[PDB]
Enzyme design. Structure first.
Site, PDB file in Angstrom:
ATOM      1  N   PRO A  10      25.511  50.975  40.633  1.00 41.60           N
ATOM      2  CA  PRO A  10      25.946  50.931  39.169  1.00 41.60           C
ATOM      3  C   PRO A  10      27.180  50.310  38.704  1.00 41.60           C
ATOM      4  O   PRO A  10      28.074  50.156  39.534  1.00 41.60           O
ATOM      5  CB  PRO A  10      26.424  52.321  38.790  1.00 41.60           C
ATOM      6  N   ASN A  11      26.963  49.403  37.745  1.00 41.15           N
ATOM      7  CA  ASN A  11      28.009  48.393  37.074  1.00 41.15           C
ATOM      8  C   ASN A  11      28.420  47.177  37.853  1.00 41.15           C
ATOM      9  O   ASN A  11      28.907  46.117  37.424  1.00 41.15           O
ATOM     10  CB  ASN A  11      29.309  49.205  37.019  1.00 41.15           C
ATOM     11  N   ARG A  18      33.225  37.566  31.315  1.00 44.71           N
ATOM     12  CA  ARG A  18      32.935  36.502  30.602  1.00 44.71           C
ATOM     13  C   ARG A  18      33.212  35.115  31.222  1.00 44.71           C
ATOM     14  O   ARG A  18      34.292  35.021  31.870  1.00 44.71           O
ATOM     15  CB  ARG A  18      34.042  36.377  29.534  1.00 44.71           C
ATOM     16  N   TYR A  23      36.383  29.530  36.120  1.00 48.68           N
ATOM     17  CA  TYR A  23      37.593  29.564  36.938  1.00 48.68           C
ATOM     18  C   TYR A  23      37.527  30.082  38.353  1.00 48.68           C
ATOM     19  O   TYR A  23      38.413  30.529  38.908  1.00 48.68           O
ATOM     20  CB  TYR A  23      38.729  30.154  36.433  1.00 48.68           C
ATOM     21  N   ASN A  74      26.608  48.516  48.528  1.00 51.12           N
ATOM     22  CA  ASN A  74      27.874  48.765  47.778  1.00 51.12           C
ATOM     23  C   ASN A  74      27.266  49.694  46.819  1.00 51.12           C
ATOM     24  O   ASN A  74      26.763  49.395  45.861  1.00 51.12           O
ATOM     25  CB  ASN A  74      28.112  47.733  47.224  1.00 51.12           C
ATOM     26  N   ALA A  77      30.113  53.393  41.979  1.00 50.40           N
ATOM     27  CA  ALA A  77      30.583  54.755  41.692  1.00 50.40           C
ATOM     28  C   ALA A  77      29.840  55.823  42.413  1.00 50.40           C
ATOM     29  O   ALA A  77      30.575  56.892  42.877  1.00 50.40           O
ATOM     30  CB  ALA A  77      30.538  55.097  40.164  1.00 50.40           C
ATOM     31  N   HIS A  80      31.097  58.016  45.473  1.00 52.12           N
ATOM     32  CA  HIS A  80      31.816  59.321  45.356  1.00 52.12           C
ATOM     33  C   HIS A  80      31.213  60.632  44.736  1.00 52.12           C
ATOM     34  O   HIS A  80      31.489  61.538  45.002  1.00 52.12           O
ATOM     35  CB  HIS A  80      33.093  59.026  44.373  1.00 52.12           C
ATOM     36  N   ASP A  87      21.203  61.111  51.318  1.00 55.86           N
ATOM     37  CA  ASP A  87      20.334  62.002  51.895  1.00 55.86           C
ATOM     38  C   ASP A  87      18.840  60.858  51.917  1.00 55.86           C
ATOM     39  O   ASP A  87      17.910  61.031  52.970  1.00 55.86           O
ATOM     40  CB  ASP A  87      19.783  62.934  51.215  1.00 55.86           C
ATOM     41  N   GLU A  98      28.439  49.978  54.660  1.00 56.96           N
ATOM     42  CA  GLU A  98      28.954  50.394  53.325  1.00 56.96           C
ATOM     43  C   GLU A  98      30.063  49.168  52.950  1.00 56.96           C
ATOM     44  O   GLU A  98      30.909  48.916  53.646  1.00 56.96           O
ATOM     45  CB  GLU A  98      29.541  51.716  53.288  1.00 56.96           C
ATOM     46  N   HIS A 100      32.638  47.720  49.745  1.00 58.26           N
ATOM     47  CA  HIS A 100      33.437  47.882  48.657  1.00 58.26           C
ATOM     48  C   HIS A 100      34.154  46.771  48.187  1.00 58.26           C
ATOM     49  O   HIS A 100      34.957  46.164  49.104  1.00 58.26           O
ATOM     50  CB  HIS A 100      34.373  49.162  48.505  1.00 58.26           C
ATOM     51  N   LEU A 101      33.999  45.941  47.258  1.00 61.31           N
ATOM     52  CA  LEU A 101      34.882  44.781  46.799  1.00 61.31           C
ATOM     53  C   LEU A 101      36.258  45.021  46.755  1.00 61.31           C
ATOM     54  O   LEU A 101      37.332  44.361  47.357  1.00 61.31           O
ATOM     55  CB  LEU A 101      34.490  44.138  45.550  1.00 61.31           C
ATOM     56  N   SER A 102      36.718  46.168  45.975  1.00 58.80           N
ATOM     57  CA  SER A 102      38.253  46.338  46.013  1.00 58.80           C
ATOM     58  C   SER A 102      38.397  47.546  47.131  1.00 58.80           C
ATOM     59  O   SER A 102      37.693  47.905  47.741  1.00 58.80           O
ATOM     60  CB  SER A 102      38.506  46.985  44.311  1.00 58.80           C
ATOM     61  N   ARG A 107      43.085  53.163  44.705  1.00 59.18           N
ATOM     62  CA  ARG A 107      42.886  53.491  43.549  1.00 59.18           C
ATOM     63  C   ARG A 107      42.952  54.891  43.126  1.00 59.18           C
ATOM     64  O   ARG A 107      43.782  55.629  43.943  1.00 59.18           O
ATOM     65  CB  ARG A 107      41.416  53.143  43.259  1.00 59.18           C
ATOM     66  N   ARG A 111      38.262  58.476  44.291  1.00 63.91           N
ATOM     67  CA  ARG A 111      37.842  57.305  44.990  1.00 63.91           C
ATOM     68  C   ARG A 111      37.829  57.100  46.454  1.00 63.91           C
ATOM     69  O   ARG A 111      37.237  56.320  47.061  1.00 63.91           O
ATOM     70  CB  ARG A 111      37.947  55.828  44.207  1.00 63.91           C
TER      71      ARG A 111
END
Lengths: 146, 151, 145, 141, 143, 138, 147, 140, 147, 151, 138, 146
Positions: A10-11, A18, A23, A74, A77, A80, A87, A98, A100-102, A107, A111
């Site tokens: 998700p996300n 934007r 950049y 990845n 959310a 967690h 499963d 696994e 994770h970007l951050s 955090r 998390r």
């Protein structure tokens, strides 16, 4: 030809925000193309998929059964919260890494726990998109050793 | 020239010494030599150090102050117990990546907590020796951005 | 005579390096103690063995300890036991306010057995600890008198 | 002429036979010492949150530093914490006894994390150190 | 010749200098070594107040020592590093404590060594070391 | 222009079976009375709800959300709201604090502008008033 | 004639002093209620005794309470018991979002027995609380006519 | 000769207002004590300052305290410290069974330092506390 | 014509693929129920929305639910609320013994509101759940006859 | 004369009875006889008792009041659950050593807590049947100190 | 032949005061209906229950047990069952998960073959079916 | 004439036996006789029983079913461990008051929890033998209500 499957939860479809290409930022589409082409250049097939719900992700994991040799995921959310995805990965018996970007450990406390980390081959957290690159290199090295 | 410091904590000197090998025949020295050669081949300097105590490790970290640009560290058991090493890394303000050969999350519950992970740039766990290679690659990418910023 | 030992834990040697340094504090405190008529020794190290050995060396010749354990405040049961083994009263000092930082810094293996604790008053915290130490030694000297 | 306010919480009025020198002795000593340095020091003691909070609000805009030993309220009073934060006056928390050496419930404070500093276990001398620090801070301003 | 290594952690060097008696750490080391040799076994001993010194001694015992008797002192509650050193060299060990760790502060109830030790003896003073030696020998007799 | 989105989570479609539709229609009616446009959506899964949240990116100015059970379980929905940077107010018909302990925690409360709990359908009315007042400030 | 009591706890008197003040809110709410035909009293204090005494004083003459307990929401079991003792429905209000602050502010001794809770909406929270109180009383009134 | 102080905390004044009131209990205990040759004072308040001040006022002149702190049993370290400051033995009393209520009512800042605790026996709890206090004052 | 609904959660479709399959179980239970005069519908999905939508669809036409929620028993408050919303009694079934696995599998958001739970008895657990559902319905039907 | 009471709790009677052996052919009776014979040979009295319930064990403890000087007890599972046995031992004021054949710290987390360990003179865990021998040795040394002090 | 032992813990004798006897007799009847033998026992103390478990060693093939309150407190009964190496199924008449939090933990559940809870007397019927089923795959 | 049952748990039989005295020369038997004599003098019947195990206590509780009107019980250490005794008392539906000689809250933290206090009519702790007298007075007052 051995096959690797890249899964994003998700996300993650929202990466870049934007005007990403103004950049040096990047979209999920950019990352997927990059990894796909890079795997192909090494003689491997790489499929990718992204979804915002457990049913969609679990169905894709089941579809990989017996035709996919390694997974890079990845879960966003769901890392967690989803025992169901844990499963699903265990049910298909496909090794996975696994990513994770951050840095999840930097955090919120909620998390700091993952329903995938203890059963993953390994975990890479906090290195941004490069984390997927390392996961791909490792996946291929594992497939080579067989 | 930019420099990277490779740090290994307690018991890492036992790599490849156990008979029924866990990772193989590779030793800590093999990893150290491999990483140093790889760094130099890319135009970077790399020092390496390993010790089984906080004082030795902390003194080496302090010695790196103002001459080292990035740190790759596998703290061993100290990742779960050493607030002292955490504070040393923060005191010298050198960015670092935490590396672990085995998957710390697949072992005892007490190994799930770290005093370094939350302040590290990133963490790589469970990928064996390859983890150090990825850490070196990332370290170099960061140093490249620093060099460009100094222009 | 009546001696005081200043102990500083890991990373304190980095003070003023990234204006007052650890050395500035050590020399200042030693001179202040001397002006007040007391001999003060100081030591700093980044490991438990070095610190514990110095504590053992203070046994039977040192009457009070002022200690800023640094990160070891939260992790070292060994240093707690070293201080208890030598039976030398001590005051715990911290430059920063430990209660205003991460939750893990809210616990100390020394606070409950310390005579007292001073946290968050910077270098002045050492001056107050020294003043208290001297007041305690004065009572000891008179008591043995 | 800067002003310092000394605040003492519940039960501190009973100093002397409570589990020598009285609160009155400490208050006189501190006031006289502050005056000798050219500072004005007011003091107040009460056994309830309303009385203490009202005194804190009254200090708003006329008091430069607070020295407070909240007594039992250090462990229970979020209200006093919020009063001190509302008036924006820096303060030092003082405790005669070593709170860490007593019951587990005394190990937590609703003031420590927002205090400039804390002094615990040094008896009445703790107030002297707090005054010295308060004055040093004001000399900077 | 089977070899046994006696390890003592932080603050054990203070024994008899301050609970237990005039007996010192040296007294115990000598007594245990004498007893071991009198039974046809070799025994080395070591004591240090830091993890590095203790871990290095444990690594040095790799492949030449058959059993370890260790009183880790306070490190039993804090040292995952020593736990990992003992596991890395694969030498069975027994944990010994002079005082009863369960009768003190709550934090002394947790250990990073007890669960991987062959057994633990706590609260029997210096005699605990004697029993540990007896057990070590009995175990070595199995092999 | 002046757009508000009302979102309702799992099981809210079962209300009264006032009804959910009664609430949706009343908020749309009231929003229109003040010159604002209001859209509404309800679903029983994270994917459907997250997709609707993403669809609101850069075209919706305020969100009123009752996540239902997801309030206590969905980090994914929290992240979807944070991803679109749209301010929101959390609403619950019942008093969550008076129910089981697992309902006392919300993955949205700390990042919401505010929360209204226990005032039934009126809570949605107040949430809309607040949204409009916030938009008028901007 | 129905009556509503507005109660504010410790430190709320400092509003706008650190531009709307507590007095501004009190007067605004009283004027709003009165214009709708409802009497409204207001009170604020920094101690449990004062607040508890005011709550007891409302027994049998007040029909609804709007209360912002301030810091006492996290510590006062005594005020909880006072509100329960007088059996008057109440709404808990907080200007700031307590869930976005320190963890200790996440617990309340009043929330579980309150009719409802409004947090983080600023002064408008009081307006919504009043609207709810009146809406409730209006239903009761119409019910009495039809009974 | 010997004196007993009956203390009641927040909300106890509401007893019988929601038949027996707090006043009935205060008067009953005072009469019973005086009939037995003992002096008994009583006091009730809804705040810590009022209660703590009354406790301090009893220092060195009161021999036993019977206290129902109401909700402050769960929150007042201040009252605990006031009772410890005056060194007067006390019995904690509660009309209802605190253990049968919410979990937060299962903790007390007074119970561990009280001579004893009586809970859930209604007004009769105060009678038993008075009986015990007198027996204690008799052996002294 | 009473009806029973069999629901299976995430990953249950993998049964016998890693010999009896999920379809084998569904067909078996439907045949057993319908041979006893009870209609039985079955459904399986890997997500909360699909499962919840099916539960809502059972409202007012289904008399008992047999559900193996899979991993959702540990995470789904949403399914708990769906089952409570339709007021249909249910029995929770698990092929494996959830208490003999990781500690996180010891907690459930469904067990406390279920009529009963059967865990660790393999596929036969579904048979026992069906027998119980039918037993309950049979007592209700006889009661209706004798009234 | 001084006396030692050996107490064994629930399930200890199953020692040496399980087909696949865990400790060996040694049975509870073997241990009981071995310790009693050893104590007697050294000039001391030693009684032994084993039961699977608190009432039986507590009654035996009360029976030991004022006539027994030291207790060696392997409470079995009751070490984790019996506050009643803890209070019985405290009520009779007889010092004791707690013994366990297996290493309780190497098993489930619930076995890490004990209602007896904190009030025991000492604890021996994980050394099999030999643990009882060490407990007996210590008990006799303690009794000797008492007799010596008797002047 | 195959023998099954039914064990019931404290207070279960107070049932209906169906009764405990109704259950014991029904399981014995159903066991015999398939050619199996079934013994039953009930007691209000750990010593009595543990002694019966030890007595079953090497002569009993499966155990059906409702430990009653001991489910939450008896590590000793857990260890007795493990000591005799006889597989067992745990049963409870009421739904333990719907009661007080202290009843949410069992010292037997993690080592039992399975657990059935909340189905009243029928739970025992199913437990027996399972026991017989297990003794046949062998 | 409505009966009261006095129950005492593990270790209560040790009362008055330990020389370094805690409560006094008074024994459990003295309390039993004293309470029974008092109940009878007031026109009530009173039985008493003491045992060191759950089976013995639970069996006595079951035997009181339908013939006993009120229970006065000092469960000793079982107040902290016996869910079984809690369930026995609930099963017979007989109101009871819990009594303890010492103050259970002034000791170890584990003694703060009870499996009986929340279902008892009331609890009296720390008043020594006098607590039993108060319990009897209360039991009778409750019976008079009937």
């Amino acid at each position: 030809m051995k096959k690797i499957l890249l899964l994003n939860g998700p996300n993650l479809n929202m990466l870049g925000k934007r005007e990403p290409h103004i950049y040096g930022s990047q979209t999920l589409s950019d990352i997927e193309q990059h990894l796909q082409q890079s795997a192909q250049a090494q003689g491997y097939e790489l499929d990718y998929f992204q979804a915002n719900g457990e049913e969609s992700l679990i169905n894709r994991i089941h579809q990989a059964f017996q035709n996919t040799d390694f997974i890079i995921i990845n879960p966003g959310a769901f890392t967690h919260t989803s025992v169901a995805i844990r499963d699903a990965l265990l049910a298909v018996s496909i090794p996975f890494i696994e990513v994770h970007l951050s840095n999840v450990h930097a955090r919120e406390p909620f998390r700091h726990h993952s329903y995938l980390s203890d059963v993953a081959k390994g975990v890479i957290c906090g290195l941004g998109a490069k984390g997927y690159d390392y996961a791909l290199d490792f996946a291929i090295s594992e497939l080579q050793k067989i």
